[PDB]
Amino acid sequence: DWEF
Amino acid sequence: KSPADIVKNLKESMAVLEKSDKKAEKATEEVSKNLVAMKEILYQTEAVAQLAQELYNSGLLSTLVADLQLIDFEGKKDVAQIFNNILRRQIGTRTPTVEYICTQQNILFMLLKGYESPEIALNCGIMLRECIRHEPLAKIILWSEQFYDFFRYVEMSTFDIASDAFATFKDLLTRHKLLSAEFLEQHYDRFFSEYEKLLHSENYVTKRQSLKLLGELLLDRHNFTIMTKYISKPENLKLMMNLLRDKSRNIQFEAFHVFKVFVANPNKTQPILDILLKNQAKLIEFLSKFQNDREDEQFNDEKTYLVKQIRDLKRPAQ
């Protein structure tokens, strides 16, 4: 998953 | 008889329909016959000229739109066909029907509201899209509050009508470039706030078409200021990155097209650069494997370019  | 007579008779029959059975059946038959007679005039150069003048003067053009719900199935299509022909009338450099509608704007508002009536929605769409070909009419519609009703129409449960409203909506946003660019700039916050919701539509079609249109809008040279602003917001990058992982392959692919725009930007805002750095290695790996099955070649070259762009990302001077 992306991390923002 | 002549154009004036046909216009007079049609105006009278329309009046009856607005007011049944015996009398209604006759008025419906008379409306149908007069509409067919008007078509025959369209297909005497002055007879046509005469019909147009009578149509403006009598208010019948406006009445035919206002009363469209009262007209029979084939008759509604004849109104559209007659309207579409008269709309293109030319006198030298002038388009009199366009000038006419500019001073009769309720015709456009009534046509737009028609999307809310199942039995006339498609005919309204047809006439609206013909109006939209003329920059002054596109402008009236685009600057109107009713333009925001398209966000509701394209999300309608009747998908065929939603799709038709989307074609009208897309035409408005893409046909007259300077006009659309000026609109988007002046109403940026409200427009993109509504558009952001389209990108979460349950109608897979509206969602895919909306993402595709966003890509087209951002890439047009006339929209440079709008694009620059859109690719500066963290929330927009976030949404596109999340769409790269959508369950739908087409959605991911359309999202990739917008994503590229964010990355190609030589002057990123810090919130944007920071998101890319925080996901640098992941993005490099992800892009190196993204739909590698797809032979597009332009697509493969774009992945190569983006992988290099991400690898080369650097914080500038503090």
Swiss-Prot record, chain B:
Changing residue 224 to A: Abolishes activation of STK11/LKB1. Coiled coil: none annotated. It is found in: Cytoplasm. Its main location: cytoplasm. It holds the Pfam family Mo25. One of its GO terms (molecular function) is protein serine/threonine kinase activator activity. It comes from the Eukaryota. SUPFAM superfamilies: ARM repeat. Keywords: Cytoplasm. InterPro entries: ARM-like, ARM-type_fold, Mo25. One of its GO terms (biological process) is response to thyroid hormone. One of its GO terms (cellular component) is cytosol. Belongs to the Mo25 family. Component of a trimeric complex composed of STK11/LKB1, STRAD (STRADA or STRADB) and CAB39/MO25 (CAB39/MO25alpha or CAB39L/MO25beta): the complex tethers STK11/LKB1 in the cytoplasm and stimulates its catalytic activity. Component of a complex that binds and activates STK11/LKB1. In the complex, required to stabilize the interaction between CAB39/MO25 (CAB39/MO25alpha or CAB39L/MO25beta) and STK11/LKB1. This is Calcium-binding protein 39. It comes from Homo sapiens. The lineage of its organism: Eukaryota, Metazoa, Chordata, Craniata, Vertebrata.
